[PDB]
């Protein structure tokens, strides 16, 4: 995350971190329930074997609430292609259930029609992760969040060098230096409605980070609600 703020105690409890053999985060995820994590399909090629960490806000210390979970089942969208980044979604079933607590809680899955009419029409959403804090830099040791305006679909298509499919949406800023970045992929985009946060996107891709005239591109969760529901059953 470029710009934005630290996630303070209990503020981003649905954040999950995918960690490789070396115990380093390489992608984010969203806690959906005690057994399930939402992530980006493209993250599944960035590590041969990986686990999921929850409850972490600082990769340098032990806060007492961190928990590592092994993955039992990886459910990747079969239509995902590296070429277009379309269908950039995957669900992970964990071997053991997540114990909810301070800094560990699921984000709500909304209903489609309502999410599209009421959540996606809000001014902003919130993106979070342990990703780079500058286009060129190392992964953040601290969990960060950033308020990102929803971007008009027309403006986003005009701004993009590549096709923005109906499974994608844009959020962020035209010129202001704030955006998601490398390592934030797969992480949560949530939208607040009456103090309840609903998952609305998956950090997917961007032409660099916080570039002028470019926005962050997210998987449109509302397009996959049935698929997610089936994957969880």
């Amino acid at each position: 995350i470029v710009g934005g703020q630290e996630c303070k105690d209990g503020e981003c409890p649905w954040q999950a971190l995918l960690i490789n053999e070396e115990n380093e985060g390489f992608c984010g995820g969203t806690i959906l329930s005690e057994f399930y994590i939402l992530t980006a399909a493209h993250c599944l090629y960035q590590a041969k074997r990986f686990k999921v960490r929850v409850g972490d806000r600082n990769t340098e210390q032990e806060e007492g609430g961190e928990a590592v979970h092994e993955v039992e089942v990886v459910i990747k969208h079969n239509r995902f292609t590296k070429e277009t980044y379309d269908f950039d979604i995957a669900v992970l079933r964990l071997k053991t259930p997540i114990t909810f607590r301070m800094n560990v809680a699921p984000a709500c899955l909304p209903e489609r029609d309502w999410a599209e009419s009421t959540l996606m029409t809000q001014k902003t959403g919130i993106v979070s992760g342990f990703g780079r804090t500058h286009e060129k830099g190392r992964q953040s040791t601290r969990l960060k969040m950033l308020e990102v305006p929803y971007v008009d679909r027309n403006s986003c298509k005009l701004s993009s060098s590549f096709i923005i499919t109906q499974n994608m949406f844009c959020a962020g800023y035209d010129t202001k230096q704030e955006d998601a970045c490398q390592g934030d992929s797969g992480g949560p985009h949530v939208t607040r409605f009456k103090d309840t946060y609903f998952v609305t996107g998956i950090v997917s891709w961007g032409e660099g980070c916080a570039r002028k005239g470019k926005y962050g591109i997210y998987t449109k969760v509302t397009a996959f609600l049935k698929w997610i529901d089936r994957s969880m059953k």
Partner: protein
């Protein structure tokens, strides 16, 4: 602005229009309150709530 377009039908969460009236509902882990509008958590860690 009418029904669900009028301040979300006064629903805490999901708003649907059945017939010509508002029907509220909630995400899993919540129960619809007796007033048929508010959503009440069933446990200490309901989805979408910061743990503050």
């Amino acid at each position: 602005r009418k029904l669900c377009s009028l301040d979300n039908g006064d629903c805490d969460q999901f708003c649907h229009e059945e017939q010509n009236s508002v029907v509220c509902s909630c995400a899993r882990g919540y129960t619809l309150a007796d007033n048929g509008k508010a959503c009440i958590p069933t446990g200490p860690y309901p989805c979408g709530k910061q743990t503050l």
